[PDB]
Design a protein around this ligand. Structure first.
Ligand SMILES: [Ca+2]
Ligand SMILES: [Ca+2]
Ligand SMILES: [Ca+2]
Ligand SMILES: [Ca+2]
Lengths: 83, 78
């Protein structure tokens, strides 16, 4: 309906358009995360550094809460460009 | 990239409402109540989000709101 609701909707579906390609469909592996960004945001394994930043449980996959934190970092940054 | 357009909606919506009164960088109770009603009680949500008890929602605090919503949307998606 409203652009905000449509925004939220994109965040949740985008997660699942990539998490279900391999392994648990609930978690983005390294590969799924790399496909995610490259195709949906703006690429060498500095994915590694990100993985590290986001992967709280050191299980080497990004679950949905963990992705939620990525989305936040992005918003904070989009917010500063905005000013 | 829709994702990007989504993140864009996140920040501009905040600012579409934060600069109406008081600091242009925070949402008062009134601005918050505007956001939400036009874009999707408050007292109990204020209490939830207002980490510093200053009675304004700064951008980080709004961030925690957006997360709450995604967690939810993620459920209705299952
Ligand atoms: Ca997966
Ligand atoms: Ca993890
Ligand atoms: Ca304000
Ligand atoms: Ca506050």
């Amino acid at each position: 309906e409203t652009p905000l609701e449509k925004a939220l909707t994109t965040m949740v579906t985008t997660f699942h358009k990539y998490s279900g390609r391999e392994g648990s469909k609930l978690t983005l592996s390294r590969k799924e995360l790399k496909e995610l960004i490259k195709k949906e945001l703006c690429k060498e394994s500095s994915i590694d550094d990100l993985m590290k930043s986001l992967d709280k449980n050191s299980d080497q996959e990004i679950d949905f809460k963990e992705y939620s934190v990525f989305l936040t970092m992005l918003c904070m940054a989009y917010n500063d460009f905005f000013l």
